Symmetry: D2
Subunit: 274 residues, 4 copies
């Protein structure tokens, strides 16, 4: 597995007007765009062929991941060995392919939109609005890539949440295979806490097998009138293998205002000042 897909064509509503001309995934956490954390995360797991589904402010994605000749000459007097090491590696070690999602019909349609970039290969999906950090060990995506070579199924990252906060996520339920691994049998997107079948909510880290594409084409609109992955993975869990995995590490919900501030404050004390 060497491919990673990044959906970045949402409405990004909780951060207007800042997200007017840049996607929610480009917001900087102190000094690093959300999506740059995620791309560095995928390279750690060996996924060096990056594919980005773009929408409004698509141009902020591209310009960030180009060889900037303006920036190149402005910083002639180095000190890029102090600030650009991370972004430069990405440009020299990764390939970036971009494709446009014309109409916002949900995450599932966004994942289906990137099919020509993936083909008949297993691929990872990273939702950058979920900032995942594991400074102690390997990042969440590497945890899931190592898990794929062993089980060779779809893997979805999850973590327990409060039951009142359950209608904000997709939630899975199933029998346990290991200390932190589950056989999924049911998946619902943003259910009513009364109908919440579990307290095990997905973060947006997914490892998908190419047969998911033909399943998304069979998925009908669900929560919010959008085509949810969650429903496409559900169909895959019945006739196939889909594992839920409680990752090791810290996650911030940077799709929310509150979570973004937590991430900004966290990364300043533990990442910037150092």
């Amino acid at each position: 597995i060497k491919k990673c897909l990044f959906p970045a064509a949402g409405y990004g509503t909780r951060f207007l007007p800042a997200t007017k001309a840049m996607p929610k995934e480009m917001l900087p956490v102190v000094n690093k765009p959300l999506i740059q954390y995620a791309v560095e995360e995928a390279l750690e797991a060996g996924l060096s062929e990056i594919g980005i589904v773009t929408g409004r402010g698509k141009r902020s994605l591209e310009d960030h991941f180009d060889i900037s000749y303006e920036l190149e000459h402005q910083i002639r007097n180095t000190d890029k060995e102090k600030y650009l090491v991370g972004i430069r590696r990405l440009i020299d070690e990764c390939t970036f392919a971009y494709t446009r999602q014309v109409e916002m019909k949900g995450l599932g349609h966004a994942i289906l939109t990137g099919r020509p970039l993936i083909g008949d290969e297993p691929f990872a999906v990273v939702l950058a609005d979920d900032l995942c950090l594991n400074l102690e060990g390997d990042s969440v995506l590497k945890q899931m890539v190592k898990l794929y070579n062993q089980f060779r199924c779809s893997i979805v990252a999850i973590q327990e949440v409060p039951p009142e906060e359950t209608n904000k996520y997709g939630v899975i339920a199933g029998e346990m295979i290991r200390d932190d691994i589950f056989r999924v049998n049911t998946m619902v997107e943003k259910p009513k806490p009364e109908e919440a079948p579990s307290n095990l909510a997905i973060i947006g880290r997914y490892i998908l097998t190419p047969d998911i594409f033909d399943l998304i084409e069979q998925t009908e609109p669900g929560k919010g009138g959008e085509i949810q992955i969650t429903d496409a993975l559900m169909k895959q869990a019945q006739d196939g293998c889909v594992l839920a995995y409680k990752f090791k590490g810290k996650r911030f919900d940077c799709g929310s205002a509150e979570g973004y501030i937590e991430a900004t404050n966290f990364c300043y004390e533990n990442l910037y000042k150092t």
Copy 2:
């Protein structure tokens, strides 16, 4: 009446890379509002509806944010979430935006001289958006300074009392006191070693300038760091013209620095976005 405001936004922003690789430091958002948007709403509150932006590395993010977005109108179509956009929309309908490039980074003074085609022979305000200035209790810092200009009709410089140890990070002025908050600038030095700054009154990024400053910038030689400093050009004006330093009403976060940027983020989330 003073009606133009200039925004230098062609800095290196070396402290906020890589995020500033393709967007200027002045476009960083506190919670969900770019720094420069606060400043333009500040300028419009003072009656300055003719905005001119001097652009540099990430020129497209400045233009794209203050441009009408026909895509945005289609995605948030039919009233929908205008609750997040009223501020920016008002700017687009009531303000005019003009852009000009600074291709060589030679200092804040040179950047202001670069905006001369956008200004001409009339007084204008200069705003450094990396200084987030807020006055919840009343008029904005720029509105305060515009009212002072209509009165004295000379160049006005925003200042604030600063600890003596941090005097090497700002421009410092000194002069005789005309009022508890207004000083007639005698002396101006950029970033002074702390037992050489003539006072502990530091310049904040808000100016009102008279057109004669342009020809004074052309006579200014490179100073601190080899850059052309508006502080040095403003010194020449003090000698045989009027320059007033004003201790403004309000709070200023140093969002040009990483620590001040977070102070502003946390403050605005608790008092403004959560509201």
Copy 3:
């Protein structure tokens, strides 16, 4: 109530038109960027302004506003791909970037050429200024550029100047037409101006070509102008007001003009510049 008639230093370029005649190509590019063989229409125009001594260029941008900006800004990528010398081609554009200052402002809604010129008011101020419509490709290889001729005439008589040329009476509905007293063979004092009149109602056969010298009171006159032909605000109608209680001169310029706002003139200009300029 005092009109400044001082030295001219600024030139304004309206480039926010819909450009429907070349619509596929202009989807993301202004009609004024269509290359005549290898040089964009507007580059010809800005070189015209530099020859006249006007190094302060303001561009009113629209749909493909980004094609304009990228062509006149310092492209660091372009310099990297050479810096070793195929700058025979880049002599003209590098000159413009080194000797001119460019400022841009957007026209939000298309209400006409007059509204477009008013849109550039923040770039101009209370100054006399020239206006160039880049879809009118003007060449004078045996002498001065059209705008250079017009600047010389302004410096002497200090009025608003409108470049004109005689055209057949049947094509009069494509242009604005003037009529007035003839001071000398190539100079007229304008009395009346109508935009795209029907051939029966045309004041003369003297058609306005996109080269203007304007005094800054035209701005206040554009704001008083009511929508005209097609519901747009025409500069012709504001200049009509100025011609009444002021001085507006029509100038029969020397040189060849191509109508590159029409497909036919675009093809004609392409072949002319290819044979007489490109293999040279």
Copy 4:
């Protein structure tokens, strides 16, 4: 079967400076339609709806041309949404465009290898948009070649008979003749000296390639002008595989040269614009 088409558009295009400064040579307009739009309509006509563009110096104008324009729609309200827009809306309606950047201009072969993430392990067509090919009497050149591929399932290269004096401008092929217009290639040379030109038959910018060409390009050393030539890579394929040359039916204009660009403009003006 085959559904993908690749468009290299990251050349230097210096013959068209300064017009190409911020736009690729493949975006130049022929009277009113960009050169690369003709080519994509050609690819759609052949059933190739998955478009991949390898971009470079003017990569922005490309993206913009094939992306949805909310501004252009708002500016029209169902009016001239026929006119010249008919062709380009169908393209955005029926195709999927993916873009990847060519960081280093090392040749046409390197440009095709750069697009490997967009193609994968499946056959694809390559189109050089500077070759304007028009066949008003039937199928498009690419359509002809896709039909030929469905039978032989080799790599197919479009060729054209040219005078021996022009062989240093093209890649030239030589091989045993299968039919009056189909040849089994065993030799391929890029821009040979007319004296050593192996034949009269010159390569036009239309290809059908099998995915093993990718690994062939990585093994290819710098050729003509020190650049990586697909001609040299296709040579390797012809020796250890099957490569067919096809005298296509239709008229081709060399819009990579100024003279041929004028020819295309005049031709398309008389025969297509009025129509």
